[PDB]
Amino acid sequence: GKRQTEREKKKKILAERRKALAIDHLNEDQLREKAKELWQSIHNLEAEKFDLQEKFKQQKYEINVLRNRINDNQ
Amino acid sequence: TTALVCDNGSGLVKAGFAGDDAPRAVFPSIVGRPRHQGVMVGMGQKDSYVGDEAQSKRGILTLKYPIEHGIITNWDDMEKIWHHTFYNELRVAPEEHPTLLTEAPLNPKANREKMTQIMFETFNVPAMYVAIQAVLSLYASGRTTGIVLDSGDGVTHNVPIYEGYALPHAIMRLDLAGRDLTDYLMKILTERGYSFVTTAEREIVRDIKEKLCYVALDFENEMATAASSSSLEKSYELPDGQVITIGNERFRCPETLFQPSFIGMESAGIHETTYNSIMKCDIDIRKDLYANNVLSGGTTMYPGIADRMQKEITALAPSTMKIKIIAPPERKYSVWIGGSILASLSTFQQMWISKQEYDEAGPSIVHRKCF
Amino acid sequence: TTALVCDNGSGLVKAGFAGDDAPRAVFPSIVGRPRHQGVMVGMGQKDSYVGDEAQSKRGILTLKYPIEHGIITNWDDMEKIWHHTFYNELRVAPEEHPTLLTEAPLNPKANREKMTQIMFETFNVPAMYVAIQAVLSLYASGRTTGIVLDSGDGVTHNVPIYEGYALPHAIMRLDLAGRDLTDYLMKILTERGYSFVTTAEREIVRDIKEKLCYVALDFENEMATAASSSSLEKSYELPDGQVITIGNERFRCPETLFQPSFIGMESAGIHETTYNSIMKCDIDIRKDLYANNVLSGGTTMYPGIADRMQKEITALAPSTMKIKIIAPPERKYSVWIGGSILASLSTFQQMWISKQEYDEAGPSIVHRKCF
Amino acid sequence: ISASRKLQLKTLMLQIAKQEMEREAEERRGEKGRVLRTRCQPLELDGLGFEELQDLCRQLHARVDKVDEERYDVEAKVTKNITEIADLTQKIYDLRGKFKRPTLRRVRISADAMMQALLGTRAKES
Amino acid sequence: DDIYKAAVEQLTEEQKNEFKAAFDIFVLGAEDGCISTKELGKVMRMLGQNPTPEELQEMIDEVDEDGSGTVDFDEFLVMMVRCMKDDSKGKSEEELSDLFRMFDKNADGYIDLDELKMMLQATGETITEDDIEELMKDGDKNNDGRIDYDEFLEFMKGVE
Ligand SMILES: Nc1ncnc2c1ncn2[C@@H]1O[C@H](COP(=O)(O)OP(=O)(O)O)[C@@H](O)[C@H]1O
Ligand SMILES: Nc1ncnc2c1ncn2[C@@H]1O[C@H](COP(=O)(O)OP(=O)(O)O)[C@@H](O)[C@H]1O
Ligand SMILES: [Ca+2]
Ligand SMILES: [Ca+2]
Ligand SMILES: [Mg+2]
Ligand SMILES: [Mg+2]
């Protein structure tokens, strides 16, 4: 199933992004490092999502341009 | 908000917002990949032309319908057709509109469940409902009783209804429809010399069938007349010239409806499956069904069918009952008009399959109370 | 950098940088060794004069074309011609310029593979691409459909194209072209007393054909008129005096195109191979091909051919279709203009056969995806 | 108006639009950085019992999961949107492209060479 | 178009006298007193360039407005500086497309001419409202009162 394939692939990516958060055995400094890793990952995802938002705004405006030209080309 | 009354059909997809008189966009449901190589660079050649675009470039495509007989045989192509219908022919995102699909009676369950799963996962509609294609055609006539013969292009089915109570044991579904008539016409045209083989030329034969064929009131007399005089031979101009002349192929193509032995089918014609569907009903509602016989669907648009069918049923039925055949001029879109009326009702507003309900019971919700 | 759009042809080599309107250097493709002994010492006599230099010393040379019918029969001479074209007529070393050769349809593979091997090993170009001579002529017209009849000097081929998708099963390649017309004219001139035999005098007969011959609108009427009056006899001055008078040889030489039985060829004329090429196409794109018939190549420059061909096709074709023959004034260089346009495209910039690709797969790379 | 002032206006508008677009892009980047720094909150819990440390580990693991789910969904949506945009661009071109074939001229060689070929011996200053 | 007019209006009377004397010397012995399309084409053939008569007619129609087929003093200088095309490639398509898309600050697919007014205020060249009016007339091909994206391409087509 192509839709099944999409759902399965997205869930696979979801699973992959789930790193092994098995770390209590670490000491204080290592766990602080891991927390910073998570924090930096979150901030980078924030940057990625902001880029997605601005690119979506651009895509919507360009689709408006496209529809304008379509109407012009009656 | 407003509801989207889509109607997949088989041969023409008809869609439009609920509450209007006619579907907004009507276009053939064909998806055709190009088949030749292609030498011009940068021409912007796509990989699949769907809908009405592939009826203009059909010279270099291989059109293939994604719906064979009511059932859907190629789910990817059907998804493509739906995506086109939503985004380019109506230009309304499905995230903000309920949908009302239509389905033939006695179809496989898996088809309906996959349809609802697609509508809820890919297009992500708020709520969708699936309705039987004959009840809508009964809505459009403004009746509440009557036995409706909905001879589409994929499958011909005959659902009797009384006082709003459908009779599930009297549905007679027959798989002869417009497509088989097109194939039979394409097969009998070879008796004069015209050979149509390519899947693109099936469209030309369909146009010939639509514009020229008619149903004879009496078959033997017409066969005798066409074999002596020449008052029937009507000519038609192909898409390139070389006019053709159709003789007694005119009324022999749609005669297959009343004698399915022509294409080798065993069953009885549409004139006798209606009488059989009536006789399975109870003895006290047969008069009302006799008086309110309804025609619908595209294939019942042949000039002169509402008289041939009435003559046949009057021959079969008891002499006292009155036989009346309702044939509205808006036959082709009758199902969609009925769908619009049903979606516009206030009493119906709580029958939709809401998305949270689907999340709790899975796609098998459609067979449950929300039918 | 800029691309070199070379176009080998057969009879005239046309070359120039991509992005211009006309080829930079156009010169006959003949290589002629001297044939007499030579007594002056130190005159600086070379062993082979190529290109336009051998059209001025042709009195003591034996000119021989290195390309017979599209195919290349003498690879050393062709290499010499290419070397001259690159170094003396354009003065650009090939180490810094992509090349875009052109090739007739349905040619032997070995010819194309040897061509690419030469271009990559001897001249050592960065990347070369081989294109069919008819698609370019379709580029130059600014169309995207149409059936192009490219009657060169070596071979006449007729490639139909629709919406950018070439139809490989409808290419009709015929080997009658300008050279056979030159030979036939040289053969019918003997009926008045003028005998041209030497390979140098073939050039004089070619000049006569170019300057005097024309295609008759109706052949029998012209044959009758030229046999009674004397309004057609046009005179021409040889390279030494002794003017000659051409009578009904004027329209009999190019008539061979429409009746190849004159030179003993069996096949049908260029007026009927186009109709046959159309009829092999699908039934739905025949109107567009009828309306967009394109002429190209040198030999289609005869005065009055765009009317004779239209009359013939209108006679053959169905009466309803409109027959239109596109005959741009820049017919001779149409293929090269199209080549320049194609080489100037941004979308095409990644289709070149890069040298590292050739090093990995050998000369047989040309038949692969990089066509 | 005189074409010189027209070209001057054209290049002035080019510069104005370019500088304004660049300034607006830089401002958008600054706002993006500011707001993203506002959205993600730095933490400081070093030296604490590993129970709370791992509680933060799990909380931020789940948080990473949520942000990844959201961002990847949005990214897939935006990729689909850009694909559709390209489709519509191709549609518009195939509707009304064709004639968009450019022309390049090289026969007009540099005017010095043309003047030389014209003059010859008297090609001393021109 | 008027590009050569702009280029020579940047230039001064030095070019005027230069091309006048060049006409005096090279076109010496002529009977027309100007340069004709066929005249310049034959001159190109004499020097070694190979222009076509159709190109000759096209270029003379481009340079000649009154239909005379010759060159006025300003037209003569425009044609003389025309034969060589030093400046090409006309800015960049994508960057200017982005500039125009952000020009529609309202992002409605339409250009408010007040935005044009403010941008011109930024430009500040000695210009009257009728000058920008004429510029828009040059640009607003469909006369919709705004700047269409395709018309934005057209009026900036090849503009350095
Ligand atoms: N005017 C007409 N005359 C005869 N046959 C028609 C006419 N219009 C449509 N048909 C036949 O009906 C078919 C369309 O039926 P339709 O009702 O659209 O099917 P569906 O139920 O799938 O929508 C066509 O394939 C054609 O063969
Ligand atoms: N003006 C003309 N009139 C008639 N025939 C011509 C004319 N010009 C060229 N030809 C013929 O066309 C040939 C040149 O064709 P060309 O298009 O150069 O071939 P290729 O496709 O090999 O380049 C010459 O051999 C000549 O016979
Ligand atoms: Ca003038
Ligand atoms: Ca704006
Ligand atoms: Mg139906
Ligand atoms: Mg050629």
Coordinates of N, CA, C and O in Angstrom, one line a residue, chain A residues 3-57:
Chain A
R3 N -0.1 4.4 0.5 CA -0.4 5.1 1.7 C 0.1 4.4 2.9 O 0.7 5.0 3.9
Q4 N 0.0 3.1 2.9 CA 0.6 2.2 3.9 C 2.1 2.4 3.9 O 2.7 2.5 5.0
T5 N 2.7 2.5 2.8 CA 4.1 2.7 2.7 C 4.5 4.0 3.2 O 5.6 4.1 4.0
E6 N 3.8 5.1 2.9 CA 4.1 6.4 3.5 C 4.0 6.4 5.0 O 4.9 6.9 5.7
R7 N 2.9 5.9 5.5 CA 2.7 5.8 7.0 C 3.8 5.1 7.7 O 4.4 5.5 8.7
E8 N 4.2 3.9 7.1 CA 5.2 3.1 7.6 C 6.6 3.8 7.6 O 7.3 3.7 8.6
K9 N 6.9 4.4 6.5 CA 8.1 5.1 6.3 C 8.2 6.3 7.3 O 9.3 6.5 8.0
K10 N 7.1 7.1 7.5 CA 7.2 8.2 8.4 C 7.3 7.7 9.9 O 8.0 8.2 10.7
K11 N 6.6 6.6 10.2 CA 6.8 6.0 11.5 C 8.2 5.4 11.7 O 8.8 5.5 12.8
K12 N 8.8 4.9 10.6 CA 10.2 4.5 10.7 C 11.1 5.6 11.0 O 12.1 5.5 11.8
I13 N 10.9 6.8 10.4 CA 11.7 7.9 10.7 C 11.5 8.4 12.1 O 12.4 8.8 12.8
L14 N 10.2 8.3 12.5 CA 9.9 8.6 13.9 C 10.7 7.8 14.9 O 11.3 8.2 15.8
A15 N 10.7 6.5 14.6 CA 11.5 5.5 15.4 C 13.0 5.8 15.4 O 13.6 5.8 16.4
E16 N 13.5 6.1 14.2 CA 14.9 6.4 14.1 C 15.3 7.6 14.9 O 16.3 7.6 15.6
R17 N 14.5 8.7 14.8 CA 14.8 9.9 15.6 C 14.8 9.7 17.1 O 15.4 10.5 17.8
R18 N 14.2 8.6 17.5 CA 14.2 8.2 18.9 C 15.5 7.6 19.3 O 15.7 6.4 19.1
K19 N 16.4 8.4 19.8 CA 17.7 7.9 20.2 C 17.6 7.1 21.5 O 16.6 7.2 22.2
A20 N 18.6 6.3 21.8 CA 18.6 5.5 23.0 C 18.8 6.5 24.2 O 20.0 6.9 24.5
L21 N 17.8 6.8 24.9 CA 17.8 7.7 26.1 C 18.0 6.7 27.3 O 17.2 6.7 28.2
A22 N 19.1 6.0 27.3 CA 19.5 5.1 28.4 C 20.8 5.6 28.9 O 21.8 5.3 28.4
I23 N 20.7 6.4 30.0 CA 21.8 7.2 30.3 C 21.9 7.5 31.8 O 22.8 8.3 32.3
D24 N 21.1 6.9 32.7 CA 21.2 7.1 34.1 C 22.6 6.6 34.6 O 23.1 7.2 35.5
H25 N 23.1 5.6 33.9 CA 24.4 5.1 34.3 C 25.5 6.1 34.1 O 26.6 5.9 34.6
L26 N 25.2 7.2 33.3 CA 26.2 8.2 33.1 C 26.4 9.0 34.4 O 25.7 8.8 35.4
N27 N 27.5 9.8 34.4 CA 27.8 10.7 35.5 C 27.2 12.0 35.2 O 26.5 12.2 34.2
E28 N 27.5 13.0 36.1 CA 26.8 14.3 36.0 C 27.2 15.0 34.7 O 26.3 15.5 34.0
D29 N 28.5 15.1 34.4 CA 28.9 15.8 33.2 C 28.4 15.2 31.9 O 28.0 15.9 31.0
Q30 N 28.5 13.9 31.8 CA 28.0 13.2 30.6 C 26.5 13.5 30.4 O 26.1 13.8 29.3
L31 N 25.7 13.4 31.5 CA 24.3 13.7 31.4 C 24.0 15.1 31.0 O 23.1 15.4 30.2
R32 N 24.8 16.1 31.6 CA 24.7 17.5 31.1 C 25.0 17.6 29.7 O 24.3 18.3 28.9
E33 N 26.0 16.9 29.2 CA 26.3 16.9 27.7 C 25.1 16.4 26.9 O 24.7 16.9 25.9
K34 N 24.5 15.3 27.4 CA 23.3 14.7 26.7 C 22.2 15.7 26.7 O 21.5 15.8 25.6
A35 N 22.0 16.4 27.8 CA 20.9 17.4 27.8 C 21.2 18.5 26.9 O 20.3 19.0 26.2
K36 N 22.4 18.9 26.8 CA 22.8 20.0 25.8 C 22.6 19.4 24.4 O 22.2 20.2 23.5
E37 N 22.8 18.2 24.1 CA 22.6 17.6 22.8 C 21.1 17.7 22.5 O 20.7 18.1 21.4
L38 N 20.2 17.3 23.4 CA 18.8 17.4 23.2 C 18.4 18.9 23.0 O 17.6 19.2 22.1
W39 N 18.9 19.8 23.8 CA 18.6 21.2 23.6 C 19.0 21.7 22.3 O 18.2 22.4 21.6
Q40 N 20.2 21.4 21.8 CA 20.7 21.9 20.5 C 19.8 21.2 19.4 O 19.5 21.9 18.4
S41 N 19.5 20.0 19.6 CA 18.6 19.3 18.6 C 17.3 20.1 18.5 O 16.8 20.3 17.4
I42 N 16.7 20.4 19.6 CA 15.4 21.1 19.6 C 15.6 22.5 19.0 O 14.7 22.9 18.2
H43 N 16.6 23.2 19.3 CA 16.8 24.6 18.7 C 17.0 24.5 17.2 O 16.5 25.3 16.4
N44 N 17.8 23.4 16.7 CA 18.0 23.2 15.3 C 16.7 22.9 14.6 O 16.4 23.4 13.5
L45 N 15.8 22.1 15.2 CA 14.5 21.8 14.7 C 13.7 23.1 14.7 O 12.8 23.3 13.8
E46 N 13.9 24.0 15.7 CA 13.2 25.3 15.6 C 13.6 26.1 14.4 O 12.8 26.7 13.7
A47 N 14.9 26.1 14.1 CA 15.4 26.8 12.9 C 14.8 26.1 11.7 O 14.3 26.9 10.7
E48 N 14.8 24.8 11.6 CA 14.2 24.1 10.4 C 12.8 24.4 10.3 O 12.3 24.7 9.1
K49 N 12.0 24.5 11.3 CA 10.6 24.7 11.2 C 10.3 26.2 10.9 O 9.4 26.5 10.1
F50 N 11.1 27.1 11.3 CA 11.0 28.5 10.9 C 11.3 28.6 9.4 O 10.6 29.3 8.7
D51 N 12.3 27.9 8.9 CA 12.6 27.9 7.5 C 11.4 27.3 6.7 O 11.0 27.8 5.7
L52 N 10.8 26.3 7.3 CA 9.6 25.7 6.7 C 8.5 26.7 6.6 O 7.8 26.8 5.6
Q53 N 8.3 27.5 7.6 CA 7.2 28.4 7.7 C 7.4 29.5 6.6 O 6.5 29.9 5.9
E54 N 8.6 30.1 6.6 CA 8.8 31.2 5.6 C 8.7 30.6 4.2 O 8.2 31.3 3.3
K55 N 9.3 29.4 4.0 CA 9.2 28.8 2.6 C 7.7 28.5 2.3 O 7.4 28.6 1.1
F56 N 6.9 28.1 3.2 CA 5.5 27.9 3.0 C 4.8 29.2 2.6 O 3.9 29.3 1.7
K57 N 5.2 30.3 3.3 CA 4.6 31.6 2.9 C 5.0 32.0 1.5 O 4.2 32.4 0.7

